[PDB]
């Protein structure tokens, strides 16, 4: 039989090569974890990353990251109740339930 893992290789070595320049950017975690990351000089620095210690969101040493609201927390039972029913129906069922409870 013949088989191949989807992996590519090159006839090439580490000796006798000059490495391109890189810059170390520092990131900090909420709990105090700090780490360094090497990036190419001809690169853009993203504002947010994941931590190398506890796998939580982390920002740069200098903070310039605001919050943009995401639109998909809506799903609850309350908003569906608003969508399905008007306020008067909820008020009258509420009044009936209080009446029977205090009865």
């Amino acid at each position: 039989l013949r088989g191949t893992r989807l992996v590519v290789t090159s006839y090439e070595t580490d000796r006798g090569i000059d490495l391109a320049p890189r810059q170390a950017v520092e990131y900090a975690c909420e709990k105090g974890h700090r780490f360094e990351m090497p990036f190419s000089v001809e690169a853009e620095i993203p504002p947010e990353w994941e931590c190398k210690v506890c796998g939580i969101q982390a920002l740069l040493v200098d903070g310039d990251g605001p919050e943009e609201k995401k639109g998909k927390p809506a799903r609850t039972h309350w908003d569906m109740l608003m969508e399905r029913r008007t306020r008067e129906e909820l008020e009258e069922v509420l009044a009936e339930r209080l009446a029977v409870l205090r009865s």
């Binding site: 191949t4 992996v7 590519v8 290789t9 006798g16 090569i17 000059d18």
Partner: protein
């Protein structure tokens, strides 16, 4: 995708034999060929980069490279390199 030792040794021999053929060429010819194809470093530099070292014009770098290819692509130095292709 397993490194076959025969293929690795063949490639190493090809790499060692390629430099010798460039050795018999003049200094400028071997230098410009190596820089253009990045044999020594792996980064193929532009014609202006090559001409900066020697100070010759871009067009000069264009011509000097062509003569080297004509020399190597001749029935006088091809035999040493025919097998590896």
């Amino acid at each position: 995708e397993a490194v076959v030792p025969a293929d690795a040794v063949s490639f190493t021999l090809l790499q060692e034999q390629l430099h010798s053929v460039l050795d018999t060429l003049s200094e400028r010819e071997a230098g410009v060929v190596s820089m253009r194809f990045g044999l020594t470093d792996g980064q193929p530099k532009t014609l202006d980069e090559i001409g900066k070292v020697y100070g010759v014009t871009r067009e000069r770098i264009r011509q000097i490279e062509s003569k080297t290819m004509s020399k190597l692509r001749h029935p006088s130095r091809s035999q040493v390199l025919r097998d590896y292709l």
